[PDB]
Amino acid sequence: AQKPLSDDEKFLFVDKNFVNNPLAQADWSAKKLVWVPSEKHGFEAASIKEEKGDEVTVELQENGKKVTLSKDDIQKMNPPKFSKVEDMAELTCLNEASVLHNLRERYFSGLIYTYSGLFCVVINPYKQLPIYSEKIIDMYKGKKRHEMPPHIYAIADTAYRSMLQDREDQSILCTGESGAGKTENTKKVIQYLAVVASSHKGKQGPSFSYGELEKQLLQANPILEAFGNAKTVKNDNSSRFGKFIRINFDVTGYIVGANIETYLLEKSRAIRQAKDERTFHIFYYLIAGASEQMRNDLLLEGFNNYTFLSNGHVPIPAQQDDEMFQETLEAMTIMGFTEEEQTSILRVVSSVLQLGNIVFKKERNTDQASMPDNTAAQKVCHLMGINVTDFTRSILTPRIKVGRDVVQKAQTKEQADFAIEALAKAKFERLFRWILTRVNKALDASFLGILDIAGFEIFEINSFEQLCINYTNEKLQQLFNHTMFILEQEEYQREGIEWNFIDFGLDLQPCIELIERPTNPPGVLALLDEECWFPKATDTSFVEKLIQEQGNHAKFQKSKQLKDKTEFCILHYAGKVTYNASAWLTKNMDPLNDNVTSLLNQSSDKFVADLWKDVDRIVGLFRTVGQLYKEQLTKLMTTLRNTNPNFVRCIIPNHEKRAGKLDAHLVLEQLRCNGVLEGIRICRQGFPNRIVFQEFRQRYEILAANAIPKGFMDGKQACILMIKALELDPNLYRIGQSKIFFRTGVLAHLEEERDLKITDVIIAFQAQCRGYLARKAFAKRQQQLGS
Amino acid sequence: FSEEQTAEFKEAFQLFDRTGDGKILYSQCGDVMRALGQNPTNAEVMKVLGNPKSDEMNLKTLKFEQFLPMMQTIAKNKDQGCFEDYVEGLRVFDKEGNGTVMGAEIRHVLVTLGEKMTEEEVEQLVAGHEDSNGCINYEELVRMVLSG
């Protein structure tokens, strides 16, 4: 019996205005209706025909077919009154089936965001739904949890307030496998907070003039997306590096600052891209968006004139690199990069590409490939503000200085490249990290944390990168497991409430030790670290040793007798993966020709100057990559544990990159390895809300004005009185030592009431304010008149 | 209303027309009543406006002679707020009997309950009463709008 919904609202709102048809309300008699297996639906509707002990006969309420399955392969169905629910934690039946079902429906109906107890699921639409707009922003602004439907803008506001309420920093962590939308959902959270919390200069979809800084806070992400994102067999615009954005608020609740902690930038691909994959967007953008003039200015020959672009020039669906340029060019300006300050950041790109043309053909005479062609490095050295001859020698004949010797030597064709290669390759990273601090230079008591890590990805060649990436992914998940089941139950113990433990069986510590732990049973990273510092050792040598230590690790497994490639497997949470240990020691060391290194360190070109200005760590003969990372990633894991987590579990619908297509089991597993169900049991089982004896007799005393006597009284007891005063059911709450533990919703209703008990007064007061606020601003226009 | 004031009322009413016909858009009625030291709630104003509609509330006009009859009708009312209760309500948002509420929580309530105000409205109000910790002392803020 409710309002009518615009075709659009039907995308975030449930259609409930219909007739109370008793068709379903009558069919209920087929009570024998249950859920059961389906090699094509994951589960499907059917009704019991005959219960025969451990087994039972049933007929598909679908194919009319009659099949009998074990009396344990069937799953209770939820009433018709639950169709397309908002909070799974509501349906009177929790199942891998129902939970799936619900998600399936809402999904096809056009709604992707759904609540699951505390955290919330979010199946990628892959389509341009219309549920993000100034219009919708203001709809959710201030709106409680229930005063509106599950939507991202909601999680954002729920946190942003929670922060200002109990004064305690927060985090919004987007999980989900690669592609599931970890990124987008982040861009929104900022999008929302950029208007809902910004301060205004006084004063339709995106139509709105934001503050001065929020302006930039907005144009940042579209920059890092350039030199940092690239097309892959899993995502046309994949985030090629974890990212943790930090937004800073004052006491009044306004945005004032913003930091960005970038992580594992897979800059490898800057030299060679896999099949049907691309390099960092910006590259293509430049080779195309390049202006005729500036075109030559950086020696930007067309596509396929550069060898760092495997698969030549591959195109991206629905995206036009041509314009893409300006967009980012436009961004850079918004951000702050000086007119020329950019032109530069561009040449340094072409440079990172030309350095790829440079050749070194073997020499069967001396056996030290040479520079049969100048043009190549000829150009390259120009963009570097350095010199040819020097570069050349340095690049070919390393006038190095090992230990107590000026060991002057000359490398082999290969080495001649492994350098010119791993040089440009690192010259790149020197850029990202630079911009990032240029961006972070403008964007910069409370902070909101948004985490966009790279999602579990697992292609053909499972290199090192993929190892730390799927490592973090395993890492993060475990965080959710801790804070969700482990931690929560400890406090139940602490406060000493009537509670018994529950083992949700959700731990991956093991699979972390196998790759994290150092001394004692070493971790995959450990070995590859030291074994990386010993001559008679090779990736192979490594692996073999790898088998030595781990070997029988419950989470380890040996390859398909391809130690030729020498690969290993590890049982992640998202599944098994066969990594190729090859070239791991090299990457893990990150070496490079210091000759040319320092050569630049004082180059004529200032930009390249300051870029390299810090070369003291180069290798010409300190800390290991795996531990350099693994060290900062503990810094991150540290603050997160010091903030309040808000999980937004993204979920991939299909691998066909198809919209409207939703693979049952693929989505069934995700809900399995992510801990959704369990993640909901405790929300129903335990008491996810708690409040200390003082704040309780404080907020809701207005409800029982005569429960507590005029005299003083012990916080606890004194407030237990007013609990009897509300005749609260002894199953909703749980009194503890210092705080009370309530059940879901119990506190919400308590809040509602209180807000009602005071509305009028507010109404009353509000008036006098408009009064006061008025007589004054009128008696103001009077001065400009009397002026 | 003694002619003495009635005579001045005109001075106030007149002091309210951007163009010049001598008409106060059905909207302005509120502020003009306020400016005359009136604190009519949002309803008390519509009730004596025949409950028009947004659109026509920006078209319809008023002339003192037809306005005056309302100024009074309001002027004489049944109740009014007062420190006594006024603050008694805000003191319910006093996180911990400190005697002060966060200029953000106050800023909320005021724009999410009853006659919902605007983000700017509240800004202009509390603005300058928040301390280092952005803490406002209602007791005072109360008196401010009041005695003011």
Ligand SMILES: Nc1ncnc2c1ncn2[C@@H]1O[C@H](COP(=O)(O)OP(=O)(O)O)[C@@H](O)[C@H]1O
């Ligand atoms: N809510 C959404 N609206 C529109 N497109 C989306 C949405 N969620 C994800 N996408 C689509 O999915 C793609 C990749 O999702 P993405 O955020 O890049 O995942 P991840 O960060 O996990 O790699 C995008 O290129 C886009 O087409």
Ligand code: ALF
């Ligand atoms: F780009 Al992703 F997981 F965020 F592959």
Ligand SMILES: [Mg+2]
């Ligand atoms: Mg991403």
